[PDB]
């Protein structure tokens, strides 16, 4: 076939019931994730090809960057709760991997302040039980699917994208193969 299990994707031996339609995992410490966001705009190009009625979920993971890694999962929960993902994603990536100016929870907070989220609004969210349960959701979804590596994308809790098996000579061709694969899996 043109799309082959074990080639552009793999199948989960243990399918995950009730999982989000398109589920993406990343870390702000993850170098391919930086590329996926900044250079390739994967999420964005997947969305543009997904049919109507399909929602996209993106979660942060704990297993990179130790203590700061967990702060970042909680900060991402804050970002989701306030709906400010599109304003903090780039400065968080660059703060961690480019300028290396993010070394503490306080530095993460600064990024939100500079993005215009009010200090008071941020700290209330940070400490909120709504954000607690949002952290729990990120952890549970990662736990459900055996996750030990990022970036990762899962479709309908049953298929996992396998980018190692796509041509990387050309970045644009890679992205379209990737998005077209999500679409195919989506319709599966």
């Amino acid at each position: 076939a043109q799309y082959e299990d074990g080639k552009q994707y793999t199948t989960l031996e243990k399918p995950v019931a009730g999982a989000p339609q398109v589920l993406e995992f990343f870390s702000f410490f993850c170098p391919h994730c930086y590329q996926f966001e900044e250079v390739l705009h994967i999420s964005d190009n997947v969305k543009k090809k997904l049919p109507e009625g399909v929602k996209m979920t993106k979660y942060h993971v704990n297993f990179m960057g130790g203590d700061l890694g967990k702060d970042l999962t909680q900060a991402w929960a804050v970002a989701m709760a306030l709906g400010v993902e599109d304003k903090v994603t780039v400065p968080l990536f660059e703060g961690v991997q480019k300028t290396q100016t993010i070394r503490s929870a306080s530095d993460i907070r600064d990024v939100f302040i500079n993005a215009g989220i009010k200090g008071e609004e941020y700290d209330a969210a940070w400490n909120s039980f709504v954000v607690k349960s949002l952290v729990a959701q990120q952890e549970k979804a990662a736990a459900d699917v055996q996750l030990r590596g990022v970036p990762a994308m899962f479709v309908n809790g049953k298929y996992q994208l396998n980018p190692q098996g796509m041509d990387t000579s050309n970045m644009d061709v890679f992205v379209q193969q990737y998005a077209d694969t999500v679409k195919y899996l989506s319709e599966k």
Side-chain angles (χ1 to χ4, degrees):
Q2 293 271 353
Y3 293 99
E4 269 162 13
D5 189 353
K7 177 62 209 81
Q8 298 106 321
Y9 67 102
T10 51
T11 305
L12 298 185
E13 291 183 7
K14 231 214 174 55
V16 173
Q21 298 139 303
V22 177
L23 187 44
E24 197 171 342
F25 293 97
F26 79 109
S27 169
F28 283 109
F29 280 94
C30 157
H32 286 135
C33 304
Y34 186 112
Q35 290 297 298
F36 266 39
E37 168 63 28
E38 304 271 302
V39 183
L40 296 183
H41 310 284
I42 293 288
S43 297
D44 214 278
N45 278 278
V46 168
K47 178 169 184 151
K48 289 189 298 78
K49 286 218 171 151
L50 293 186
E52 229 198 312
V54 188
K55 90 180 304 293
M56 275 175 91
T57 310
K58 174 139 79 199
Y59 291 159
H60 197 266
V61 300
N62 290 342
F63 63 79
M64 297 184 78
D67 209 90
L68 252 196
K70 293 206 64 170
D71 278 327
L72 282 167
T73 297
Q74 190 165 350
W76 190 244
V78 175
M80 289 186 289
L82 300 181
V84 295
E85 296 95 322
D86 293 350
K87 312 174 174 195
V88 296
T89 290
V90 167
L92 288 172
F93 267 119
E94 299 193 353
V96 181
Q97 299 187 44
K98 195 183 175 181
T99 58
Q100 287 177 3
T101 46
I102 294 176
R103 291 190 301 287
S104 69
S106 173
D107 300 339
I108 297 170
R109 176 174 190 279
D110 285 345
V111 165
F112 284 71
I113 303 301
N114 181 61
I117 294 85
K118 284 171 191 353
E120 155 47 41
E121 190 181 5
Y122 182 88
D123 302 334
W126 182 269
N127 289 293
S128 78
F129 284 86
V130 165
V131 157
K132 298 215 180 305
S133 85
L134 230 36
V135 165
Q137 284 163 235
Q138 297 184 86
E139 296 188 19
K140 176 179 188 285
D144 285 346
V145 296
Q146 322 330 132
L147 186 73
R148 93 175 73 94
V150 287
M153 188 178 294
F154 298 84
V155 181
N156 292 312
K158 219 177 179 332
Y159 309 110
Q160 178 182 353
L161 277 286
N162 174 51
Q164 297 89 337
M166 308 174 186
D167 315 292
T168 66
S169 79
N170 174 313
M171 311 187 99
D172 303 309
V173 171
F174 170 76
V175 172
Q176 289 328 317
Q177 184 174 4
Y178 196 100
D180 289 345
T181 299
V182 180
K183 191 172 169 296
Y184 156 82
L185 291 178
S186 189
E187 290 154 8
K188 214 188 182 67

